[PDB]
Amino acid sequence: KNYKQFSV
Amino acid sequence: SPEFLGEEDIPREPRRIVIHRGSTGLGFNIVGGEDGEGIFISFILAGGPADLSGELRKGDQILSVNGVDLRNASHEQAAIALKNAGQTVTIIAQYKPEEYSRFEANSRVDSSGRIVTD
C-alpha cells in the first residue's frame, strides 16, 4: 500500500 | 428538545483553512501518498495549531498547501511541503471519510458522514 504516516 | 450536531451531515465541499503557527508544528498527522491515492488527516493533536483552528478533522483530504496542489503528492513530499510552508499555512481541505476509512482498522462511515471505528 506504500503506507506511511507523518507528524507535521 | 436539544439540537444535536451529531446528526447533521458533515460538509463535503472544499474549504479554505488558514493556520497561523509561527515556527511550531501544525499538530496533525497525515496518511496516504501512495501513488496519488491522496493525503489525509489521521489525527489532530489536542491544543495544537490545527486543533485551535477548529476547522480540520480526521478524514479531511489535504488538496493544497499555500497553493501547492497535493492531491497527487507522495506522503514524504506532502510532509515536507507542510513543514516548510511558512508561518502562515493556507490549506484547502475536503472531507473524504470513505477514502480515509481504508487506512484505519475497523473504520466505517455512518449516515451523517462521521467516521466510526468499532
Side-chain angles (χ1 to χ4, degrees), chain A residues 2-8, chain B:
Chain A
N2 190 231
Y3 161 78
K4 285 213 73 186
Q5 184 160 171
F6 296 92
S7 298
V8 299
Chain B
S1 83
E3 175 158 293
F4 299 116
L5 279 41
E7 35 195 299
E8 294 169 4
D9 295 338
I10 297 174
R12 276 167 187 268
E13 302 84 8
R15 307 108 53 202
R16 181 180 306 99
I17 297 88
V18 182
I19 294 168
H20 309 275
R21 47 73 175 273
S23 294
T24 191
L26 287 156
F28 63 93
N29 274 48
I30 54 167
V31 295
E34 117 74 295
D35 188 64
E37 76 188 341
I39 299 302
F40 303 84
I41 300 183
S42 59
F43 177 97
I44 300 181
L45 176 69
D51 183 23
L52 297 208
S53 79
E55 297 162 24
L56 293 169
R57 79 204 308 142
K58 179 177 77 167
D60 280 335
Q61 187 181 355
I62 307 298
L63 305 185
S64 64
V65 62
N66 292 349
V68 178
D69 179 9
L70 300 181
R71 288 175 306 143
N72 295 292
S74 68
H75 33 237
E76 184 172 3
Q77 285 302 319
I80 288 163
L82 289 161
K83 292 180 166 183
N84 289 276
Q87 307 163 94
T88 306
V89 183
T90 301
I91 289 160
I92 306 304
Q94 184 171 27
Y95 185 57
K96 289 281 182 153
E98 295 79 17
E99 300 185 29
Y100 168 81
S101 73
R102 86 162 276 261
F103 290 102
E104 184 167 6
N106 289 325
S107 304
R108 62 186 168 84
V109 182
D110 77 10
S111 61
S112 72
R114 283 171 171 80
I115 295 152
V116 179
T117 307
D118 301 294

